[PDB]
Design a protein around this ligand. Structure first.
Ligand SMILES: *[C@@H]1O[C@H](CO)[C@@H](O[C@@H]2O[C@H](CO)[C@@H](O[C@@H]3O[C@H](CO[C@H]4O[C@H](CO)[C@@H](O)[C@H](O[C@H]5O[C@H](CO)[C@@H](O)[C@H](O)[C@@H]5O[C@H]5O[C@H](CO)[C@@H](O)[C@H](O)[C@@H]5O)[C@@H]4O)[C@@H](O)[C@H](O[C@H]4O[C@H](CO)[C@@H](O)[C@H](O)[C@@H]4O[C@H]4O[C@H](CO)[C@@H](O)[C@H](O)[C@@H]4O)[C@@H]3O)[C@H](O)[C@H]2NC(C)=O)[C@H](O)[C@H]1NC(C)=O
Ligand SMILES: NC(=O)c1ccc(N2CCCC2)c(/C=C/c2ccc(OC(F)(F)F)cc2)c1
Ligand SMILES: [Ca+2]
Ligand SMILES: [Ca+2]
Ligand code: NA
Ligand code: NA
Ligand SMILES: [Zn+2]
Length: 804
């Protein structure tokens, strides 16, 4: 109940929201149907429009007008944004040449530059170039401030997940807004864009910027605007708040625009009708900047222009229907569209089985336009599994497509020409970032980055301590003139052992064999030196990874590779090796095909054994350092050590062997040498974080050998490819992957063909940031380079996307 009989007199767009049943005058009161009776009259004035004209200049104040052109308007803070231009001979902000803002130039009583976030729904990254002729204010922000060619949204590339990620620095799985529609089985409640459930606080996890600010004594403008409040009024309200006395004035503000998304759905991302919404958004930016200029704040405020996601061409005719695949379509609930999420229609139906649904959805049609996944098998880069609101079955839909349950859903709910929600690496889903103001750099282009990074920077801009989040704080220091955050590298928690030769061959009873019984003082000292680390400079190029948790492990040196061998997991945590452009690929010789050799540096008790693999009919093994890339016939024996062996399903061995035999040498040829670090990952509870021992769900049959859920590789070379990877003077270049360790290749519909037709496609889908691997392994890479630590943090958040 609302007692809408109070009044909004002197309360229009009040900051503190009052409690029911007292009526509200805040910018969201319309959304709650709780505004006081006179809210429209007093707070939503429209009379005479939004612009001064010549005849209005110096007018007598009429309180009824939307904005003012009287002499008193400046001290009242409520002039039309073009007042000084029309009436005082001033220029529009956009017509002024840009001049570097070297220091904040702020009016007295301003304690810090205010931050204004100007957020635009559905603003596709390529609109910055393609619409630049019709967006002169935005183009000035872009060219004069700091910009990225695009900013990567989070998956799913929907509005609510991305807006809340922007505000929190969190992945959707952590902040809890995992879709625009959700069902939470614990609450037994549904979240929808329409309706009241979405205002319940229990949906919204983490800590958004406006709460971080308030908790630390920084006043925030309300970030949200009821849809019926026109943009011009949103701007005037922000400019009015900026005129408040110092003790009442917010330091952070947000504007939100439902455009160009609204029109993009109707017309497609580049429909001819899209020009007008882009002009309109530019005009709104113009009003803000002219308004700031009138307040003498245009060289004081940091302005962020940022989108939530892009927009793709999608029409009704490009819809896959689950009724064309499933016998039992009425026994499931689908959350449809540009991603699919499936669960049981009834929790009472015990005939429901996700395995038979996945199978019925797998490679059934030649050009099938979605792919089914159990959520834990989705590419780890999406970070889209660790939440009870994310259904176990997920459909990754091809760009330009929809999935629906039955045809009647699509013509009983063609209209639209645009949509979004797809995989966040899809080019059409990329969005925009521009920062302009004293704290941002001048005329600086920065590489693309992920929106999860911005919360930290917005906290930096406001002098706030960020709540714990998924950004990597310092990775965006290159955007900033000042307020940089200078982190220290984490401290190593476990130091390695460096074992020498401690065991005789006969102490091992591993059931392994190797034909290595075939035989020099020149060359004997040489191989001893290799075991002591004499080639380590070649193969460990950026220092050894640091282990950031408590464990027992050994550094093992070899001619061709170095490893950190875990006594607890019976395998390396990491294996590091460098392959020059000149390296040659060889085969596994016949007499060594089934060779596994005891490692006399590591006890039988801390070793794998071959008998376990013999007995486990499902499980085979592979090697982390590939025997194919041995530097010599004699060094090749090192590659068959039991301490280089890892458990691998035969289906996975197809992928791995092609990566090792063919792809590594290809990358070395193309990149002028590569350094490779490979290893296992164990993430049985799909939380994106390293499992402890007691979380491991699967072992090689009969043994204590844990089975990895994933295998990673980090592939580093010189950004200047005229220099070899191992003699690089400047910035690095990296690509990485986290490949799912699966007992079939059902994910790859073409896997019956030669690995040259499907393996690299699989690896591209599972591309990763070094930072993703760090979370999953508890390791910290690149500890010893010549490079600045912030530069290294940027490198660690890099994602190689393979979008051309
Ligand atoms: C991305 O960044 C984020 C933020 O840094 C990372 O997430 C953090 O990860 C931590 C480890 O997983 C986690 O720490 C845990 O905190 C538990 C208490 O958490 C509550 O309080 C905090 C602080 O206010 C709050 O943020 C939490 O909010 C979550 O839950 C609410 C309500 O459910 C949601 O609204 C909200 O969205 C959020 O949900 C997300 O996180 C939870 C996990 O907390 C998930 O389950 C959800 O799916 C969702 O993703 C909470 O309100 C605390 O209980 C934990 O302690 C256990 O483990 C420790 C290890 O130190 C152990 O010593 C303890 O004994 C304890 O175990 C006991 O409980 C077990 C489980 O019930 C039980 O089995 C045992 O027997 C024990 O009794 C733990 O310390 C932190 O909460 C989250 N934070 C957030 C915001 O998500 C994330 O990891 C990053 N991602 C990547 C890939 O790097
Ligand atoms: N109609 C609206 O006004 C409306 C409605 C729903 C909104 N969200 C949906 C999920 C969370 C809130 C927002 C978003 C506000 C917002 C503005 C700027 C932002 O970028 C940042 F964080 F960088 F500041 C982040 C969030 C605005
Ligand atoms: Ca949106
Ligand atoms: Ca885990
Ligand atoms: Na086997
Ligand atoms: Na297949
Ligand atoms: Zn949309």
């Amino acid at each position: 109940w609302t007692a809408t009989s109070g009044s909004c007199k002197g309360r229009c767009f009040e900051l503190q929201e009052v409690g029911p049943p007292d009526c509200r005058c805040d910018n969201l009161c319309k959304s709650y149907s709780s505004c006081c009776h006179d809210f429209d009259e007093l707070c939503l004035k429209t009379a005479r429009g939004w612009e001064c004209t010549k005849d209005r200049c110096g007018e007598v104040r009429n309180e009824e007008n939307a904005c003012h052109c009287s002499e008193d308007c400046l001290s009242r803070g409520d002039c039309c944004t073009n007042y000084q231009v029309v009436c005082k001979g001033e220029s529009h902000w956009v017509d002024d040449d840009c001049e570097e803002i070297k220091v904040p130039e702020c009016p007295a009583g301003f304690v810090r530059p205010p931050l204004i976030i100007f957020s635009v729904d559905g603003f596709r990254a390529s609109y910055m170039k393609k619409g630049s002729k019709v967006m002169p204010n935005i183009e000035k922000l872009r060219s004069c401030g700091t910009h990225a060619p695009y900013m990567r949204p989070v998956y799913p590339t929907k509005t609510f997940p991305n807006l809340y990620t922007l505000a929190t620095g969190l992945y959707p799985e952590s902040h809890g807004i995992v879709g625009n529609s959700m069902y939470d089985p614990v609450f037994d409640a549904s979240f929808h864009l329409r309706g009241r459930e979405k205002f319940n606080h229990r949906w919204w996890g983490g800590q958004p910027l406006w709460i971080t600010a308030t908790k630390q004594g920084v006043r925030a403008g309300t970030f949200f605007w009821s849809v019926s409040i026109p943009h011009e009024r949103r701007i005037l309200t922000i400019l009015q708040w900026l005129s408040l006395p110092d003790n009442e004035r917010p330091s952070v503000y947000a504007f939100y625009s439902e455009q160009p998304d609204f029109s993009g759905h109707k017309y497609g991302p580049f429909g001819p009708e899209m020009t007008n919404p882009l002009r309109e958004i530019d005009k709104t930016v113009g009003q803000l900047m002219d308004g700031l200029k009138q307040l003498r704040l245009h060289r004081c405020v940091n302005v962020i222009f940022v989108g939530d996601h892009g927009m793709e061409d999608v029409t009704c005719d490009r819809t896959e229907f689950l009724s064309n695949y499933l016998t039992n379509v009425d026994d499931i609930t689908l959350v449809p569209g540009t991603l699919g999420r499936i669960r049981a229609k009834s929790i009472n139906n015990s005939k429901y089985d996700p395995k038979t649904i996945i199978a019925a959805l797998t490679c059934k049609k030649p050009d099938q336009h979605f792919k089914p996944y159990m959520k834990q098998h989705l590419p780890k880069r999406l970070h889209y599994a660790n939440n009870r609101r994310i259904e176990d079955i997920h459909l990754l839909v091809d760009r330009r497509w929809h999935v629906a349950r039955k045809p009647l859903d699509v013509y009983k709910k063609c209209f639209f020409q645009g949509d979004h929600g797809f995989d966040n690496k899809v080019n059409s889903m990329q969005t925009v970032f521009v920062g302009y103001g004293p704290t941002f750099k001048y005329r600086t282009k920065v590489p693309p980055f992920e929106n999860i990074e911005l919360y930290n920077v917005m906290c930096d801009l406001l002098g706030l301590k960020p709540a714990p989040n998924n950004g990597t704080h310092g990775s965006l220091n290159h955007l900033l003139r000042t307020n940089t955050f200078r982190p220290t590298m984490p401290d190593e928690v476990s130091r390695p052992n460096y074992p020498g030769i401690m065991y005789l061959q006969s102490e091992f009873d591993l059931g392994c064999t190797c034909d290595d019984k075939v035989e020099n003082k020149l060359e004997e000292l040489n191989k001893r030196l290799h075991t002591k680390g004499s080639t380590k400079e070649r193969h460990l190029l950026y220092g050894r990874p640091a282990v950031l948790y408590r464990t027992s492990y050994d550094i093992l040196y070899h001619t061709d590779f170095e490893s950190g061998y875990s006594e607890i997991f019976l395998m390396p945590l990491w294996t590091s090796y460098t392959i020059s452009k000149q390296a040659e690929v060889s085969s596994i010789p016949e007499h060594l095909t089934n060779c596994v050799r005891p490692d006399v540096r590591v006890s039988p008790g801390f070793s794998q054994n071959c008998l376990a693999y013999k007995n486990d009919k499902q499980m085979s093994y592979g090697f982390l350092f590939p025997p194919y890339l041995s530097s010599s016939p004699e060094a090749k024996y090192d590659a068959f050590l039991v301490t280089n062996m890892v458990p691998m399903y035969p289906a996975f061995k197809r992928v791995w062997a092609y990566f090792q035999r063919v792809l590594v040498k290809k990358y070395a040829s193309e990149r002028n040498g590569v350094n490779v670090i490979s290893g296992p990952i164990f993430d049985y509870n799909y939380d994106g974080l390293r499992d402890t021992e007691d979380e491991i769900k699967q072992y090689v049959e009969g043994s204590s050998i844990p089975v990895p859920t994933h295998y990673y590789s980090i592939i580093t070379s010189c950004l200047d490819f005229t220099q070899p990877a191992d003699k690089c003077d400047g910035p690095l270049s990296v690509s990485s992957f986290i490949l799912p360790h699966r007992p079939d290749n059902d994910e790859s519909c073409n896997s019956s063909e030669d690995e040259s037709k499907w393996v690299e496609e699989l690896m591209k889908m599972h591309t990763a940031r070094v930072r993703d691997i760090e979370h999953l392994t508890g390791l910290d890479f690149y500890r010893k380079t010549s490079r600045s630590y912030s530069e290294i943090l940027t490198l660690k958040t890099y994602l190689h996307t393979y979008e051309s």
